[PDB]
C-alpha cells in the first residue's frame, strides 16, 4: 500500500509540481506578450492615424 | 519521487526559462520593428504626399 500509493502520489506530484511551473512561466511570457502586443500596436497606431 | 518529479520539474522550468527568453527577445525585437515600420512609414508618407 505504501509503496504503491506512494509511488502513483510521488508521480503525480511531480506532474502537478511541473504544471505549476510551465503555469507560471505561461504567465510571465503572458505579461511579455502583452506588452509586446501593446508597444506593437501602439506605434503601429501612429502608422494608421 | 523526488528523482522523477526533480527531473520533470527541472526540465518544464528549463522550457520557461527558454521561453521568458524568447519572449521578452521578441519584446525588443517588436520594438526595433516597430521604429523600423515607423519611419519606414513616415518617410515613405513624404512620397505619397
Not at 504544471?19 to 511570457?29: F, M, N
Amino acid at each position: 500500500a505504501v509503496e504503491s500509493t506512494g509511488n502513483a502520489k510521488a508521480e503525480a506530484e511531480s506532474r502537478a509540481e511541473a504544471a505549476r511551473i510551465e503555469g507560471e512561466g505561461s504567465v510571465l511570457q503572458a505579461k511579455l506578450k502583452a506588452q509586446a502586443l501593446a508597444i506593437e500596436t501602439e506605434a503601429e497606431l501612429e502608422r494608421v492615424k
